[PDB]
């Protein structure tokens, strides 16, 4: 057996990843700031195998995917573009930020609209 690696206390630990779910409704910017506060950042989706637990998460949550209007691209925090393979993207109304929903979906939403959020920190 093994320990699941160095995470902030009372966070979910899975496959060298730390997560926390937040019930507090915040807009994108405030959500990001919150995660930053805890030496982390908003959820980045990268691997369906490594993050398969995301397949059972119920509400809608903020993740770290944003529209950069200069590149005209959708970008994760670290700078990479969104793979069309990673998520099913639903654009029901317009916006420059995206929510995560269960079954590796991405809902495009107004960055102002307060939502629950998911923070993630990558273990060492």
């Amino acid at each position: 057996e093994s320990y699941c690696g160095p995470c902030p206390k009372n966070w979910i630990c899975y496959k060298n990843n730390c997560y926390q779910f937040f019930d507090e409704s915040k807009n994108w910017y405030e959500s990001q700031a919150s995660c930053m506060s805890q030496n982390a950042s908003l959820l980045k989706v990268y691997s369906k195998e490594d993050q398969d637990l995301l397949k059972l998460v119920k509400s809608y949550h903020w993740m770290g995917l944003v529209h950069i209007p200069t590149n005209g691209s959708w970008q994760w925090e670290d700078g990479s573009i969104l793979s069309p393979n990673l998520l099913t993207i639903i654009e029901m109304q317009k916006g420059d930020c995206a929510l995560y929903a269960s079954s590796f979906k991405g809902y495009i939403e107004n960055c102002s609209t307060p939502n629950t959020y998911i923070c993630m920190q990558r273990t060492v």
Epitope: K48, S73, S83, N85, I89, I90, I108
Partner: antibody, heavy 116, light 108 residues
């Protein structure tokens, strides 16, 4: 390079068609297999996708009510079954494996003709 | 549903010409645009993915540009093997949709 599809089908209006596609490099992790058709007088239509690994599937609203996708993990085969056929359904049905930015592989096509 | 408009539907050109096909979308697709070439009785072949990235072993005479809703395939010096039907597709929101096609024939 290509992906193996079932042979050509001829069906009556009302009936159903099940097309298979044998997924070449699948090793029990995420493999999104998409389905597109092309009618003689047309460009292409996207029908749906299914991930071999978890059987998760999504459809075009136009087909969601009469299409199904099933996976057989042992044979590595995806079955697209389209269910209340009309003549407009006559087309060439392709499966394709979506890679990181585009489709990595296409199937061979399956001709499906729907007629009285 | 995002609609793709290709332009024009057919074009008659000679070997050596500059050729410019357009794909206009009904809603912003964030550079998730692909260009396909299809010869009769075969499955579509990819040339350009994302608005402007060239696929492997595609000759560099093939070039893609554009940005929001307006995208362009350019063939600088059309070669014999380039007579075909060309298609655009988006890779953004569900469902992905394709263009009507531009059929490129030999002028005489």
């Amino acid at each position: 390079v290509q992906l193996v599809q079932s042979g050509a089908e001829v069906k009556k209006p009302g009936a159903s068609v099940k097309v298979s596609c044998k997924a070449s490099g699948y090793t029990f992790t995420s493999y999104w297999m998409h389905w597109v058709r092309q009618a003689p007088g047309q460009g292409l239509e996207w029908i749906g996708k299914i991930d071999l690994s978890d059987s998760e599937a999504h459809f075009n609203q136009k087909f969601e009510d009469r299409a199904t996708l099933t996976v057989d993990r042992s044979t590595s085969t995806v079955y697209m079954e389209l269910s209340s056929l009309r003549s407009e359904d006559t087309a060439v049905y392709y499966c394709a494996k979506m890679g990181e930015f585009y489709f990595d592989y296409w199937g061979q096509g399956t001709t499906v003709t729907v007629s009285s | 549903d995002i609609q793709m408009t290709q332009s024009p539907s057919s074009l008659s050109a000679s070997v050596g010409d500059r050729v410019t096909i357009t794909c206009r979308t009904s809603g912003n697709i964030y550079n998730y645009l692909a260009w396909y070439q299809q010869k009769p009785g075969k499955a579509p072949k990819l040339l350009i993915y994302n608005a402007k990235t060239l696929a492997d072993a595609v000759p560099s005479r093939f070039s893609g540009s554009g940005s929001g809703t307006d995208y362009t395939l350019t063939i600088s010096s059309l070669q014999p093997e380039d007579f075909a039907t060309y298609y655009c597709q988006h890779f953004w929101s569900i469902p992905w949709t394709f263009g009507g096609g531009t059929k490129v024939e030999i002028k005489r």
